[PDB]
Amino acid sequence: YTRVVWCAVGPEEQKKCQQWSQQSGQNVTCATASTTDDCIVLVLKGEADALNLDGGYIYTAGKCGLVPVLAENRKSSKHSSLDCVLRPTEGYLAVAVVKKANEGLTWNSLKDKKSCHTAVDRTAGWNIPMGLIVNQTGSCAFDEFFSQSCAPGADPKSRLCALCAGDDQGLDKCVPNSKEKYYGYTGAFRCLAEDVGDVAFVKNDTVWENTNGESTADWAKNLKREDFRLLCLDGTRKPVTEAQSCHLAVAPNHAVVSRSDRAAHVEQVLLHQQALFGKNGKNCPDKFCLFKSETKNLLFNDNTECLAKLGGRPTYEEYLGTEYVTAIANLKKCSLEACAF
Ligand SMILES: *[C@@H]1O[C@H](CO)[C@@H](O[C@@H]2O[C@H](CO)[C@@H](O[C@H]3O[C@H](CO)[C@@H](O[C@@H]4O[C@H](CO)[C@@H](O[C@H]5O[C@H](CO)[C@@H](O[C@@H]6O[C@H](CO)[C@@H](O)[C@H](O)[C@@H]6O)[C@H](O)[C@@H]5O)[C@H](O)[C@@H]4O)[C@H](O)[C@@H]3O)[C@H](O)[C@H]2NC(C)=O)[C@H](O)[C@H]1NC(C)=O
Ligand SMILES: *[C@@H]1O[C@H](CO)[C@@H](O[C@@H]2O[C@H](CO)[C@@H](O[C@@H]3O[C@H](CO[C@@H]4O[C@H](CO)[C@@H](O)[C@H](O)[C@@H]4O)[C@@H](O[C@H]4O[C@H](CO)[C@@H](O)[C@H](O)[C@@H]4O)[C@H](O)[C@@H]3O)[C@H](O)[C@H]2NC(C)=O)[C@H](O)[C@H]1NC(C)=O
Ligand SMILES: *[C@@H]1O[C@H](CO)[C@@H](O[C@@H]2O[C@H](CO)[C@@H](O)[C@H](O)[C@H]2NC(C)=O)[C@H](O)[C@H]1NC(C)=O
Ligand SMILES: O[C@@H]1[C@@H](O)[C@@H](O)CO[C@H]1O
Ligand SMILES: [Fe+3]
Ligand SMILES: [Zn+2]
Ligand SMILES: [Zn+2]
User: Fold this and answer.
1) What lines the ligand 2 site, CB under 6 Å?
2) Nearest CA, atom 1, ligand 4
3) How far is the C-alpha of 189 from the C-alpha of 204, rounded, in Å?
4) Whole-number Cα distances in Å, 44 to 95, 338, 340, 341
């Protein structure tokens, strides 16, 4: 009843969900699916209540009647007078990142190069960069733009999956969950850091969080920001310190979605769950932290200060905004109004 079922994507999010479930005394329970779309279907059927989603999937879920409930808010210099839960969200910066040693690679010579995307259908990893490449290219042939990529969620036998590595045994190649070595903000950057790809479409925070000793993970231990460059749309290249003036787009924060008939209930539970296990919660550093998972962004991004109320009670188009929504529309013409499932 006042029990919420969360949908975890893949086995590592299951493992974090089961922990959260245990420490909450069954106030949150867990459902598991191999992909985000399956978790969305699980929520449509009423077999799960909520999951946190990237803007790209919020567009999918929203066509199917699902609604945003609460948004991730990270810590910010401006707007300091308001508390985190009531503070508006600033959204994040979609950037294209390259190795500095790879001289003369600019936005204008990205053709025939190797790319790393977070996952098909995500905002910074797919919709923004491919939306732009399609428009500039006046072609829908976005599968022939890069010579080879890792784009979790594309056909495993296509060039869009050629660069993906699967799990520790080489199984699940290209699956859009964390079992894939290069899934997600972190996998995509690792894909660039280890020189699999020439460019990685992630967000601004990903570079800061995985360089200059912020990670301690074996692949990122020795990464230095100076060794990276952002690609801007004017053909230029800039230090990772200038993301404010060299980004592809500002993306709407990931948000928790539920069925609208469940949203009031999912919201109450969550505000109390984060009072217990959020950034300053009664039981976080000591027993369990919702917003931690050693740089793996499981269920929530590791940099979430808190989950924020929305205000304006926005629909999914108001939440994502008219700019982003016409971009996904025009890109989706390539691949007719209805739920996908
Ligand atoms: C790309 O992503 C990266 C990574 O996410 C992001 O970098 C992070 O940004 C955070 C801030 O936005 C970083 O700061 C946090 O961590 C520092 C650790 O050093 C902490 O130290 C202080 O914290 C206090 C309390 O919040 C700050 O006090 C605030 O109040 C003062 C009042 O005077 C304000 O100061 C003013 O601010 C403006 C605007 O910047 C400035 O121009 C004025 O000159 C004036 O000084 C301001 O409100 C203060 O925040 C204090 O200032 C210190 O920061 C904090 O806890 C702080 O929150 C975080 O460390 C970064 N991550 C990493 C790993 O480096 C980039 O911002 C992002 N870039 C873009 C373009 O998006
Ligand atoms: C790839 O290419 C496609 C195709 O061009 C791009 O899609 C276009 O994006 C345009 C920009 O978002 C979009 O333009 C239209 O802009 C008008 C005006 O925008 C205004 O902003 C004002 C702020 O000062 C605000 O006050 C206004 O209210 C308004 O939002 C929008 O409104 C018009 O449409 C009405 C419909 O009847 C009309 O009556 C009114 O007079 C306005 O003309 C409109 O919503 C729209 O955003 C344009 O529509 C898109 N074009 C097509 C063919 O669909 C993608 O963005 C590119 N992709 C990427 C990733 O960049
Ligand atoms: C599980 O949920 C219950 C219900 O919200 C929580 O216990 C409630 O605590 C509040 C006051 O803190 C009471 O007003 C409710 O009556 C209690 N509910 C009932 C009927 O038991 C409990 O705190 C939650 N447990 C955890 C760890 O999150
Ligand atoms: O992605 C949009 C964009 O307007 C951003 O600046 C804030 O979040 C959303 O509204
Ligand atoms: Fe995202
Ligand atoms: Zn901008
Ligand atoms: Zn509205």
Assistant:
1) 128, 131-132, 135, 322-323, 326-327, 330
2) 252
3) 11
4) 33, 14, 12, 10
Do 165 and 173 touch, CB atoms closer than 8 A? Answer: yes
Which ranges of the chain does DSSP label H, i.e. alpha helix?
A: 11-23, 36-45, 55-63, 128-137, 184-193, 204-209, 263-277, 316-320, 322-334
Residue type at 113?
A: K
What are φ and ψ of residue 96, in 5° steps? Answer: -110, 125
| Coil, helix or strand at residue 9 | strand
Torsion of CA 199, 205, 211, 215, to 10 degrees: -120
Taking CA atoms, 56 is separated from 71, 137, 179, in Å, by: 14, 22, 20
Give the start-to-end residue ranges of the domains of the chain.
Answer: 2-73+255-316, 74-254+317-327
- For the domain bounded by 2-73+255-316, which CATH number is listed? 3.40.190.10
Output the DSSP codes for 136-190: HHT-S-TTSSSSEEE-TTS-TTSGGGTT---STTS-STT-SSTTSTT-HHHHHHH
Classify domain 74-254+317-327 at the CATH topology level: D-Maltodextrin-Binding Protein; domain 2 (3.40.190)
- Ligand 1 and 79: CB distance under 6 A: no
> How many CA atoms are closer than 13 Å to the CA of 37, on its beta-carbon side?
12
> Which experimental method was this entry solved with?
X-ray
User: CATH topology of 2-73+255-316 equal to that of 74-254+317-327?
Assistant: yes
Say if CB 129 and CB 249 are below 8 A apart: no
Cα Rg of the chain (Å, integer): 19
The rounded distance, in Å, linking the Cα atoms of 73 and 279 is 11
What would the two tokens of residue 130 be? Answer: 């491919």
244 Cα nearest atom in ligand 1: 71
State the Cα–Cα distance between residues 186 and 178, nearest whole angstrom: 10
Q: Whose CA is closest to 174, among 128, 116, 127?
A: 116
Nominal resolution in Å? Answer: 2.7
